[PDB]
Design a protein around this ligand. Sequence first.
Ligand SMILES: [Zn+2]
Ligand SMILES: [Zn+2]
Ligand SMILES: [Zn+2]
Ligand SMILES: [Zn+2]
Ligand SMILES: [Zn+2]
Ligand SMILES: [Zn+2]
Ligand SMILES: [Zn+2]
Ligand SMILES: [Zn+2]
Ligand SMILES: [Zn+2]
Ligand SMILES: [Zn+2]
Lengths: 361, 361, 361, 361, 361
Amino acid sequence: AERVFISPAKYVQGKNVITKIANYLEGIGNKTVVIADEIVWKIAGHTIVNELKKGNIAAEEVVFSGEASRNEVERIANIARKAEAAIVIGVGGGKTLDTAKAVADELDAYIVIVPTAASTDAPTSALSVIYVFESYRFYKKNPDLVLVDTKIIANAPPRLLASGIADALATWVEARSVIKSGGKTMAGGIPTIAAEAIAEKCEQTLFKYGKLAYESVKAKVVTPALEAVVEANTLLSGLGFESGGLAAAHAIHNGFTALEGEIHHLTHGEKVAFGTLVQLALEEHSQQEIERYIELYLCLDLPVTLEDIKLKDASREDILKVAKAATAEGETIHNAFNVTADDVADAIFAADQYAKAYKEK
Amino acid sequence: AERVFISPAKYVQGKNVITKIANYLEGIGNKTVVIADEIVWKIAGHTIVNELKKGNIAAEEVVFSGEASRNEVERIANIARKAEAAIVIGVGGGKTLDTAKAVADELDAYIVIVPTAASTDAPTSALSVIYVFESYRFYKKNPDLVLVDTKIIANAPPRLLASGIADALATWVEARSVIKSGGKTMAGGIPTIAAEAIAEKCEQTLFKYGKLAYESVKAKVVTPALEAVVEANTLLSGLGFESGGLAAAHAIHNGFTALEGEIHHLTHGEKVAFGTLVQLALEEHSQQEIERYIELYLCLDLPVTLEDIKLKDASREDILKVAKAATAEGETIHNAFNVTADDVADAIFAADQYAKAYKEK
Amino acid sequence: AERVFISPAKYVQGKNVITKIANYLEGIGNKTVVIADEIVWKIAGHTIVNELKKGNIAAEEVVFSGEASRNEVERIANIARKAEAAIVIGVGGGKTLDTAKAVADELDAYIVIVPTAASTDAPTSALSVIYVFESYRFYKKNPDLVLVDTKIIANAPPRLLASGIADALATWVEARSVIKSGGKTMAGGIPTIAAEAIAEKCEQTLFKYGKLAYESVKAKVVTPALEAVVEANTLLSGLGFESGGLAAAHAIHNGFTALEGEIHHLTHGEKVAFGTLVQLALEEHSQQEIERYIELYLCLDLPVTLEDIKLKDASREDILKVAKAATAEGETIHNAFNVTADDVADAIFAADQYAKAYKEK
Amino acid sequence: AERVFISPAKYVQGKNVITKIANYLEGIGNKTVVIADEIVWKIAGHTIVNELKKGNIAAEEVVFSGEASRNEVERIANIARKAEAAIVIGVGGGKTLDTAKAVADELDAYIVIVPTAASTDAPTSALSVIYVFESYRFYKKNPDLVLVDTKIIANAPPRLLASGIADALATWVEARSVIKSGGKTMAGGIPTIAAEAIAEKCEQTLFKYGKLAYESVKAKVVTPALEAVVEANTLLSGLGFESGGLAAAHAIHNGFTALEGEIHHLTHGEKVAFGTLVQLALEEHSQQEIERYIELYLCLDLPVTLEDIKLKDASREDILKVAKAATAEGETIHNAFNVTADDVADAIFAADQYAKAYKEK
Amino acid sequence: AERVFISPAKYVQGKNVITKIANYLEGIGNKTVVIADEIVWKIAGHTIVNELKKGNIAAEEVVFSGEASRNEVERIANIARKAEAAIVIGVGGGKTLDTAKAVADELDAYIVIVPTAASTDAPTSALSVIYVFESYRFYKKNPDLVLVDTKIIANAPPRLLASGIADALATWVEARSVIKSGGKTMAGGIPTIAAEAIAEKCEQTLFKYGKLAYESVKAKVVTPALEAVVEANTLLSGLGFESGGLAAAHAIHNGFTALEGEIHHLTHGEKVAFGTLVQLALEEHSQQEIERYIELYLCLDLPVTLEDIKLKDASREDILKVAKAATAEGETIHNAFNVTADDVADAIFAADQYAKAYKEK
Ligand SMILES: [Zn+2]
Ligand SMILES: [Zn+2]
Ligand SMILES: [Zn+2]
Ligand SMILES: [Zn+2]
Ligand SMILES: [Zn+2]
Ligand SMILES: [Zn+2]
Ligand SMILES: [Zn+2]
Ligand SMILES: [Zn+2]
Ligand SMILES: [Zn+2]
Ligand SMILES: [Zn+2]
């Protein structure tokens, strides 16, 4: 079969790089539209507009409603049309970035992605989720330019870095399972050797620098350990999951949308952490190998029990709902496993039990 | 400093994938221009046009003159203009592919790169050489789609695969030296961890499957070993040198343009092999480490002495010309070394001597 | 899914154990039918009858026609009926043993299997081949008693021991591929941990004692090395392939029945050797790993090139016939691979080429 | 480039060697000047004069004022002139030893250096610091004779040995960084292989015997462990930093002179310990590698947090002053790093944070 | 006991450093005397004078007679007196360098040592041999400046580099034996840890780069391998033997002066090679360990049998003369061994026999 690898055109990371935005946009154009929510306009939004003005680059300032819906995308796309802007700049978290990508596809515009936290690996990807999760949709392209300012990230909450590490720790576990079973990746074919090298390196980097990166953020300072972890959470994890493959961990994350409740205040990363423990319980690992992950999660104050994810004393019936959704036709778990909803419900309680046993030590 | 990574938008590799060209071009357009020389039109050119016709995709058939000059690029660009084609397809070797990239930049067209041999790592890159070498020039983008058909490659001459392996064996040696010295890559910043993982994996893959891949080609068959080496020669080596960094090996290759003679009938890869031995002689390696490379080159019938590269009994004055050109202001050797032309002339004769000593064993 | 393990009821091996046949049949019965061809009646047949007589055990002496057909089975089954024998004893090579198993199923009789060479792992199994290969058929049970006399085997031709080692060297290669891909075994389910331990031990035993066992046979002596290899060729290889899984190697063996010619004078083992090299060429192994097997085969004077298997200068069309038969619907290659006939034809020429390259060293 | 190695002419170490001073000065002369402060005259000063008298060697007894200034040097140099002494003997700590070296240069006299604690590696060097640090100045030569009496040192305060170990633990960390980056040493060229072997051995010796040496001193006894550590703190650390190279650790030490306060009562060694943690935070080390150093420092009661160095709750503005001074033009940090004052301020808070995290365990 | 380390004040090595001689002599003086024989005046002598003139430095040109005798030293010392030169510069081989050292001691002059081959480790030392060897004599100091130009050395005969490697390969073997037995070094006390680190590193460097350095010289080029070996042959080997200790190898070298004949045309290094094999035969090494040295010697065309050292078919009586001289009272063999002349005669024939046995393989 065919191997396929896709990637954003350019990735740039460093301390204060947001100050060179006008530089990177030189031979591209002079009119842009900038999208961000109220909070982010203060954090980095105004700084970006000011830098663009200094370079004679026009900038239509849009305030993201907060909901990534078709309407909001139609609303913002008209504004850009009117201003006849040829460059779209999305700044902030997940919803804002997906919306910015939808907008760029409508205008066939050059898109710049500027995350304000290294909390998920969605930044570099060509895809998003259509919701209770319903399916994955692809955009026409991966972003043209992803700009990551470590200074901004060293100021974001420590919990958001821990979340990004959790999402990135799922990368090798899931890709490895797709490679072994000969399944397909989101990109369309079997994994390339390039994606395998990137996903495996992603895990080694997190285990080596993860904790030092977490401490750096607590003190709001930029260090080599933080630079390495931010690259892992963004570029390695991004290419690794997209071109390396998804499996059970993210299917479990999706399965949680089948329930209502406080669990939905947790970040994408915190849900993925527990989901990763569930994939490990469905595989053949020794106790020491599983505890190696549990230990790192606790060090980063991430959730490892059903109680931690707001599902204390959940019923078998509740867990079966999650399991049925996670094993739905078309979910990624099928790319690497042959399991039934009942097998998965069983694995959810086993992971909870394994973690409690570790804590009781 | 800032780390930068760039990449072609999509890479697709597999046996007979050329038969799905119309498929990959679906939501892109229906009018294209196809560029190839006389020989390649027979090898794969007509097959591509026929596949495009089957899908109602128009195809202006251009015959590459054979010289990648501004004129040829202006000539072909007009034809595409007239046909109002929105897709450029380059098929064949180096010169044809660079020309196709120049043409796509003029029309701001979507570009598909289809190599007919895995002989150099130029396919995925955003750059070319301006000649006696004068400098490196960047195109506006890395290719949109790189399509690699292993079946076509298993039929190309064994010497061209060996050449591609030689060019790819320079990747880790050069990138490693840039990473250690803190120098910059062609992409603009310091190397990312992603590029380091890819370049190091590139070398491991070649040492493991290189010979089996060479034997596969001799018998004109496609095997897993050939699929791995073709990916290394193209995607790993491509990203590795561009986003990982160049150093002395390719500067020596360029320095050979300072001489006239039969050496210029050798392939880019065969010249890079000797150039790699020269960088190793300028570094601090034990005898066993250098011989590890010499042995693999001989197994692939690649050149390892001045005599093999058509410079038998060359004079110190001749070698100094190569050395002066290789250490020119702006060459890549400066990204990782602090050496003079005289040091480099000395290293050229040492590599020759080390190789003869090995052969005399 | 369910894991399944099956086995013959009892396996007995040792020097001169044929002399205790009357002992093992004590509480079973006193009337038997003994099946063997003309040559084997001399080798061990008469010795068995004589031992049974000494114990007051009746013995109807049947002379196997030489062709394992439904008619021969009906013929022999009547004789046993008439003699009202409750025990069937098959002695000799493959065809005789399969026939004896067919006969025992008709009479619902206790069956004793006594091989006179350790040349294939069919002895302990519950199955046979229905022929140009057409399919695998199961008997109602695995044999009740398998009796292996190392003294008899130390006198059989060295070529037959080498053949048995070849067939046994396919066991781990094939089982490992079924375990990794999650496919099924001949026994019906996924492999047990028991079968995995047995198949892996089978390979370790052959590499450690194979050559010493081969030399023992050349001198017609029984040694610990011979006892270990005879157990590997019979009990380990038998349980390993049946309850561990078949894959590409034996499918290639079957694919050879699609051709006519001198290749059909080779033993089952000699054909399996080449078939094993083909599965390794379809997998991802380094040159050193493949050569480890090639070297051992040459040491045992087993075939490793198309020329050795009587297919010198075979045409692509001839090889495609073998490939099409080997990838037929229902063949075992599908339990561990997703390949086309063309992929397999390519792997057949690669194995030939890899082996020649090794010899040219 | 050129490699350069410099060294004191002779180094002598052992228990009670101060008793053979008259012996070592035999064929040199009979008139000397002895420099020491009030406290040291009691500790070893009078013992040295008495030993010199026994050998008919004249000895002008000078009492060091306590401040190493040009005036004090002019004062003492006249006295030696008047006495027409051809040998200068400095006894005691840092300031006295530097002054003695300045005095010997004025008279072109033979100089003997006799430390009374193994607290810094200044003894063997040809240099001193010109102060708020302003620059490094070289003397005309490295000392002629360095005499180290382990008995005297086993009686000095344990805190001074711990200080010497701290200063010596910076040697390999700094030299290794200069070697990797191709920078220069204080001696003038790139490091020799000799200096690399000495600096690396220095670290291995401290990790093996450091704690046993510390306990020996607490009990005021001379042991092989103490003899090894005293040699590391004096001869290995001395040659290692001078001919091996300085980098960030000592630049941070110098940067502290930009602040006023109680921090200035700490020893040179205690400040270097924290400075070493800062260089490690600017490099790419895993958590375990950094903790290996933190653990040893705590075992020796050395400082590892800003609070320990009297800078509890220091302001970003205060830390920036240290950072600006440490990255001044001409400081040693530039021999191995490309960093800004802001990067260094960030590394100072990271080291503090890493250490607190370790303690909180 | 006391540990003692001595060293030349400054060591400088690099390509063409002879061109900066006037630079290094800046604040020292302007009148010098230059000593060299007829051949060396052409090789480097005139170049040195010319460089000194360019810097307004006077230079009395002396032609070394060729015999290092008291008379020649008195002759040259007068000339320097008359010219009132304050700097002595010795250029060339052994005898010239020792003479220059004797001359500097008479005038109490600053001495610069400039070797034209890296053939022995006498350059940095404070000692010479008084001859049939009679004893070792010390000079008043180790040299002030040792200047090693790798360009000059890359032009000296390959045999002289091999000789220097042989002399340097004796360093660790001899020092290790003194360290283990608790004996003394030439410097006066037991070995320091610094000397042990240097001597051990010396051997590792030779085994890693020795052959590459030998090939570099054959082609007359300067490489990193040559720079490393020249430092080992000069600075590491020099400090290692002087401050690390001599033992049996050099005592055997001295013992050869008891015989007359062609053996005396061999270099100091070639005699030391055989002497090293003899010390190894007197120690407890396995066959593989001894062959590791024999193999390297043969690769460098150094002598390993009595026949190679011009003593073919020597008589027991002849060998006893060498043995008696080598075990003389006061020789260095006693620093590490308790052996009789008869034991040593026996070891000389064993080494010869071991080497022949290796060659006969
Ligand atoms: Zn995720
Ligand atoms: Zn809520
Ligand atoms: Zn290239
Ligand atoms: Zn030509
Ligand atoms: Zn079989
Ligand atoms: Zn036939
Ligand atoms: Zn210090
Ligand atoms: Zn105070
Ligand atoms: Zn010597
Ligand atoms: Zn002679």
